[PDB]
Design a protein around this ligand. Structure first.
Ligand SMILES: COCc1nc2cnc3cc(-c4c(C)noc4C)c(OC[C@H]4CCNC4)cc3c2n1[C@H](C)c1ccccc1
Length: 110
């Protein structure tokens, strides 16, 4: 990995760590729309994203730069904010995990 992609991998490990598990866990795996009874999910969300998919892409060297990695993490949060009413518990959890992400992403080495 490039230096910037090492920083991204560190962020990814933190987002998956026990430290943040209380609010990160809904983002660990793809939304199982059928299992959750969310039969409109794939009509509303055209590009699903989750941390297991970001991890697989990082492991496969899919991300060529930090910007491409960040676009997937933000897509994951944006999907949550698009699908769910803003007062829902899962949106509160998204906001908290995105705060962890944005503050550490901002510490990117130049
Ligand atoms: C113990 O609870 C069972 C349970 N397992 C899971 C697994 N993944 C979930 C993913 C989402 C989710 C995200 C993220 N972004 O968009 C969605 C939609 C999730 O969203 C809550 C919606 C379900 C019904 N409308 C709101 C829930 C997930 C989930 N859950 C439950 C249902 C849950 C509920 C509230 C907060 C977190 C998890």
């Amino acid at each position: 990995l490039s230096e910037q992609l090492k920083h991204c991998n560190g962020i990814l490990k933190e987002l998956l760590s026990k430290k943040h598990a209380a609010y990160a866990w809904p983002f660990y795996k793809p939304v199982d729309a059928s299992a959750l009874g969310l039969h409109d999910y794939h009509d509303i969300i055209k590009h699903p994203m989750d941390l297991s998919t970001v991890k697989r892409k990082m492991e496969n060297r899919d991300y060529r730069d930090a910007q491409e990695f960040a676009a997937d993490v933000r897509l994951m949060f944006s999907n949550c904010y698009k699908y769910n009413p803003p007062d829902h518990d899962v949106v509160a959890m998204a906001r908290k995990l995105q705060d962890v992400f944005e503050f550490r992403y901002a510490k990117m080495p130049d």
